[model samples]
Target: DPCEAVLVESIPEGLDFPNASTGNPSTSQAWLGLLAGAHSSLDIASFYWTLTNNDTHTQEPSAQQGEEVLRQLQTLAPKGVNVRIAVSKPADLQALLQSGAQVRMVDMQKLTHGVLHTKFWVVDQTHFYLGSANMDWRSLTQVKELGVVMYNCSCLARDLTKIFEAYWFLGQIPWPRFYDTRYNQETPMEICLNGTPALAYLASAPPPLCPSGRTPDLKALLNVVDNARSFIYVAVMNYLPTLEHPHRFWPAIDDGLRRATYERGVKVRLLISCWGHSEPSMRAFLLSLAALRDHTSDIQVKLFVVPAQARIPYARVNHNKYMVTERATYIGTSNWSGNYFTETAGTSLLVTQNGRGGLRSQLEAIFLRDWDSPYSHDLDTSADSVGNACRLL
Candidate 1:
């Protein structure tokens, strides 16, 4: 089955980076469009719900778009659309309940000692949106985010719905393993992104949470780095190569970058976000990686800092979690940390397109657009703790 996919992003209001891609649609637009176009059913898997200013109690005007989105979602049930939501933590869901929508609140903390970090929407079981944006007001206008929307793509959307069903069942034991065999890593579903043929599939996280035949998100990410022949461009909010608790060192992804750069001769560029909540220890790891760069091999690192506005709290941060390589591109909802892969609930979409003007080129361009911008600064290998690069805190 031929499908359609397009890149979507959410650039915060104050970020004035030049040469931003105009081809991609806004996250708000994609969400609103999906909500508006839902004819039969709508299923959402969100980490949490804060799609209104009242949810966060900030009363900022930037949340109007989120409010509009929430308003539309509430109206879906009344229009004969079957609306179902699976969220980890929800806020102010009484309004949605009153609208006759079905909501399943999954207890990720209790089940897996992690939160439901995945964020995506499935509309009518024929279209879907997957990305790093949470169901938060800040995600719509106050955060830098990236995702992809596939329309008229029942083959891939059906596969994605299986992951959503796992969340809907609250990660039920004896997992549901039935999947279309033609859409795995070996036999990817034939897709089309902007009129270009591509190979695409979905990957879920946490070994126990996934069913048989579903590829894990971490393995997909590792393969992207392992298979890259020339370069690997990564943009993520956090890059802690350790577990959250006990602080145990877990270098599953870190080793991939190191091996690619040191042994495979592949240039790697990492754009990590530096925000008020960023861990200070992360700088040391980035510096260690940057230190490997000599007159021969290349391993560049940059910190993307969004200008702070004191009025809007928890805003102005690059929340993107994705990677682009020469062979394929991956968009996921997990950070580089270990727990996210070990027990956290997250999902990723992997697409490989060999044709010209496809997602790989666009993703590469977006990475370069930010990597070359003033907002992104090179890691200071000479200074202690990367030379005050994370002053945003």
Candidate 2:
């Protein structure tokens, strides 16, 4: 039911970062390492790639981990290394421009009415990385985030290159390259694992913006959930499945999780971040889904509140977006919401593994670890835990 896969390494955020999870390396270090090792080119994109303190709007470059990485990439240009960064908001990188780096401030509102909401790095066309972490100081130590790195895998790397090209060229409609993955889950090539023979199926948001009028990420998730025979683990910064945002609402993800419980007889566990910004409609949605838990605990939900030490601007809570099923594993750049799936430049990656110690397994362990962590609170446990304090504008 699964193909092969290799996840080389995993990077999780923490104060100690004690290598207890997957990697102890800060995202900043991993990013800097990738940039420094770049001999040919660097294609980067983010919702907001900044070297300044996004929380305080303070231009504290010296104290920001992103600055060191930015500085590394900027100087690499002098060494004939081409570096391009695309962002929906380039103002944050004002200092980056002065360093002689080519900047692309993508105006998505024109073509797709979207923002560049993807975080990625492609190096030498051989190694590329994607994750929930942004190029900010907080992503390093102050945020709960995770990412995966693919080394020397051209199939996956080249696919990522295509997404970068779309950002650079704008209107390239990169879905053809990302979608059309093997439907039978029998595609994989690898270097090592430290896993596959693993296949990478990429999915993008706002399917209408691209040539593909439907998002494959949603399809893939539904397919996996529909076929799941055992358990489904989900960890997201937000898991409100309310589809009410104009041109961006898709109910597929919400439907998938619900089906996993009421239909498939599968164990569904959701770990969502508590940031006090979720819609009441979404809150009600989860509470209703948990009704199935009374029988077989088929559905359970928890809200993870990031420690105060992990203080970023808007995303001080959990920033992870991943789901591990018995049949497949998915790591995405988008949260389970309408806007993120509609006109937001987010990524959905379906990872397959034919062997043991695969991406799904690796992710499953990480999910269990966090699901049982002290920082997590079950929404069904108490009124305070499940209370709605969202400020509606």
Candidate 3:
């Protein structure tokens, strides 16, 4: 059952820091806000962090802000507050060490193909913030971003904190100076498929067939879309065919959209990254899907290419992923591709609320901004003006 959580409150765009006053609030400002407000513990897990005095071309942390935050953490640590930090980059570990803050580095090779993408902080295990926002300067002001500041959702917070602890403990595995070829070879690690700590979840159900395993989760997603009586809003960084099995899942989505619109008469709006920001193959695929505009009589899918407005170095190309149905909102780290949901290691959250106004309002606000920004290229040909001709069909 989806949690009956409802949006209770929201701090509008103009009221928040960067947009609130004059100077743009960077990741530093948000962190500073959290630090000042936190009375007990602060847990951080990030892919990268760099603190330097001089302005560099990279999105490195400002030395001044980094040092100040470190000082604050140290001051708070001895006051019966626990301060734990985990990072993926070795450089970040060095920076934290310089500030006298103890840091732990998680080796990515042992975990998954990519680094941990979760950039969130749990303050005192009560207040929580999550989104595409990073602990970097550009993310604070320069880049268009969205995040939710949540409170009183203790259950959700506990789950996140537990995941953090698991990662923290997993980081203790000693990393060698170089890749060790003979590490797990001799041991012939007895990988269990059921009944162990890692296999406990599998024990409840039938054994999963590897390689071509059919994902059951997609059914729930279809239900969410099918249940949409009034509106469906989707925002994603990428939407394309799966590299291994290109045609399978997309057709299902197309069918679902058709049913939702023609049968249920629900309004659907989609926003996807485009142009320079999107992957070459993904952009090409999205362009191909544009032809379906004529076929989708009831479903309206809009593709938006996030514009490279400024030469902001290291600016991400469309990293946001979310879906809003009439009843619930889904936030996730995975894209809309089949591989992401089925085969790949990813994370997502289903925020279910019956009448939560805060969650609905916050998601609505972010979707509006991204939809209206010049950086966003809209695929809806019904509009008066087309910003860019990147659309193929």
Candidate 4:
């Protein structure tokens, strides 16, 4: 009963998609799919839309994938389909508005004290795509982001549709989806994906609009940590006790890591991004926690820096937020920080095997590659140059 279930299709490393026996696809390939695949509607909520290189901040007139997507949107919007997007202020606002796509800016700062830090699209309320990739040219070519595209999954799609609905209602955008089947909120409906049965739930952060008394995203992720039997591996953009409001402590997750190391003796390894954005408090916090390794060998923390020569955005290193445990796996569009929980608008997925398989094993393989790579440096005095000095502990 160890790593038994496997994936039918997975996003292979480096964002490449080739024909697979299981028919799974990659994130960029799925994103290249948005305009041509939907019959009635497409809805997307994103944080940033940069048409330029993230590192050099230089703009290009035509990036291979970026140009194709733009052409398709311009072609489709005139074909009488509903194409809608919710975004923060984008650099290329005028071009998007001219494409016949209905675009609205969400005041995410006012709603949740956070930005619109999510990237997902709804296809006709029956299928959907969610991942960490922003709507930037670099997300496809230069940056490393991960997400999933579920086809014919009405259960999960309907839940994500609610988040879109919140944006539509709160942001004053109109909705244009017509459902073929009705929803039943009272009964927990079972959904099928790839002929496998899965109990799916929509996980959202900043759950002020939700009444289940559960922030579906973070609650399920914490559950993954609490249930681990053998090992826990985490790769995230950043980690902190809290976001901008460090004075208000939300210790649900960081506490889980400490407990796993001391009580359960689970092997805990963290692969966090090492861009120039880390704050002093967060750096010191990690240094102190990683010091646990001196007393025990099971704990290791390291920083992953995308080589500068890559020429993508400096902010684009390890833009992933996930954890794969022995029993469950988590992938989401949020960072493991305070604002992402308290105010940012994001969604996540948690998967457990229902026989046919789950993606935990494939995800574990990916984590291991990054962990063993030369880019992953041990946490020590040398880490100071990787980030700013942290005087706050």
Candidate 5:
């Protein structure tokens, strides 16, 4: 039987729910709905989790919501339902522990230059909620965000579960609490390197990705971006200049996009958050690249700064990283910044013409929606107002 799921942004739309409700309903209402609906299993990964009702005003997880989610998880755990959580900060883990919920913390500091920027949850591996919505009040009410609640897609659920597994390993310290010291000394690094000279050069480098042996999938993404023609549309939270000393992967992308535009006459448009939530240096560097506006006449390079109203609490932060070429699309966990390309544990998807036009259409529609939203402000060119050229397919 195919399960019908509705996608809506407002609470009233969900009020008419027959059997299923998904998407970004009002923050308070969504939590209550989730608590009532999730019966079997709930797997969540977030960068931050604050449980305090008072903090709700500031978009932090309220104590009330925390207590409620914890109570439910505890009840579900003993009922034979699996309850697993991965949070970026130690504070979040402490909160969960205090609530008597067995929570695991992922050492985000070691895995990615940034925190675990993925906001997603799965219920019994049958339903999934993904997008820019976080588990905070601001994300639910004040800020505007986009997300989807999906069913009848077991493949997506399985893939998301695998992502949880990979990060879960990085979050856990060791098997036995008493074996912490020994585990660190005995455990060999599990780094997987793609065949790239840049990565090969970094193999013997210092801490983070090097010692952890977590070479990024730069070559794979670059190969796809390099092949793009016609047009390239991208939206992300961060973008930066190439590092000077070492030839980094991000510089390669910059060069590739330039070539795609200048050489191939491909139209390239980018939308990035103007806010300074990312690293200060990276934010400054990307702003400086705005100078490229003069030279990109042929390539049609444009950037946008997402307004405050567009931010989605823990889940959505204009954190979307994707590229749509004329023939295919690339959506992934990594940002286009140098650090993300060189030092993060990220995953991306390459949706090509695999005889499935439906997938391509779905991705295209998503891009179109974001491009049309009011809160997305233009950055590169000062037009005084939004233009239709920005929404070109």
Candidate 6:
């Protein structure tokens, strides 16, 4: 088959969730493999760069994997593979620059008053990677993350490349309010994911940043929740019913989850991340939603915490942002918050399978794997313990 996508995950070192199998290639493996397999060109769009312990001003030993990733990237340009990168935040890239990899710093803060918060790679216009794994050392070995790698899927790769090119241009020019016409929300491309027939499309955030014809990420997520027939599983790093500041509650997605649970009799499960960076106010909102659960409907909420080992700063946290429903799977880069959709730059990949047992099923398995594990604490039962863990963060 010319089109195929596989699940990718990054399990932090020194964690052994019983019966949890690494059934798919890891994020680091897929990335290094793609870098080694690049033949003609490689384009990367990332939020920032810190692939080494030294980059973060720490000498942690677990960053060796990230160091190897940088090594693999440095060797690519020497093999005649054209390399280009677009990053939102500024980072020290003297070594990469010396190795002939072209880099562009996109000023999203100045252009749109938002940060470029996308992380993906396109290789030779035939393969791509997308999910919550950022270009950080923690993403490789110090934190838990998930994503997907599409192999030999040029059709979807081409669509994702447009998002990359949009960032590339943003680095050089002003925000051009254009829309992608060929492949978009209205006309999602019909493709097969891992031998399963599916309809797939890409969505962007903060309306003006979209490069023509692209659907807003928020709309795509709401569609998934609204269309679900029986159940909805949402796992995200941040699950807030309000924005960052000015503290206005915006129930864009929270309302959908509530509606699906209360009105449609759809079972809703939320595995929200609880870490040092987790907002304290999120606890109250989740508790409120869980209180609505009774004998008829279902709304389960859990806080997933990746136990930290030693003094690994900013590590050991569930930093996942994706949702799987009965009908579709939605993977994205934005955290579930109002500002992320209102003024931030992010992207989402929505795949609606023709039938069952596609990417949706595979992602569902991962969600349950985490949900049933000892790491996931129920908000209603272990509320105080979860709050304490988050407070320590």
Tens-place lDDT per residue, model 4, 188-224, is: 3355544554444456766654434324566767777
Query: Model 4 off-target regions past 4 Å?
Result: 1-25, 52-57, 60-62, 89-91, 173-189, 209-214, 245-248, 294-297, 308-315, 354-357, 381-393
Native-to-model Cα distance after best TM-score fit, residue 70 in candidate 6, in Å: 0.5
Candidate 6 lDDT over 265-371, as tens digits, reads 99999888887677788888888788877666788898888762546667888778899988888888889988788777888888888565667788888888888
Candidate 2 local lDDT, residue 152: 61
What tens digits encode model 1's per-residue C-alpha lDDT throughout 311-389?
Answer: 6667778889999998898988888888889878888888899856778888888888878877677765233343223
What TM-score would you give candidate 6 relative to the actual structure?
0.93
Q: Write the per-residue lDDT of candidate 2 for residues 188-290, one digit (tens) a residue.
A: 3333443345545666656643334333456656676777878988888776555453434456676777777777688998887775465555577678677
Q: Give me the runs in candidate 2 sitting further than 4 Å from their true place.
A: 1-24, 54-56, 59-62, 89-92, 171-195, 209-215, 244-250, 295-297, 308-312, 381-393
Clashing pairs in 4: 9-24, 54-313, 55-313, 112-343, 203-217
Model 5 is weakest, by summed lDDT over 10 consecutive residues, at 196-205
| Superposition TM-score, candidate 3 onto the true structure | 0.66
lDDT of every model, 2 decimals = 0.81, 0.64, 0.49, 0.63, 0.48, 0.81
Full-model lDDT, candidate 3: 0.49
Report the Cα lDDT for candidate 5.
Answer: 0.48
What is residue 337's positional error in candidate 1, in angstroms?
0.4
- TM-scores of the models, in the order given: 0.93, 0.83, 0.66, 0.81, 0.64, 0.93
> Model 3, 1-393: lDDT tens per residue?
122222211121222333322222344555677788777777765545533323334444334565566556656555545667766543444544554556777765455433545556677886555555445444443334444444544444444454455446546623222312111111211212111110000000001111112122344455567888987778876676653223543555556666787777677777875434454556455544444445333444566543332344544345566677767565555556665444432344444444444455456656766566554555545333443334331
Which parts of model 1 are misplaced by more than 4 Å? 20-22, 179-182, 381-393
Q: TM-score winner between 1 and 4, please give it.
A: 1
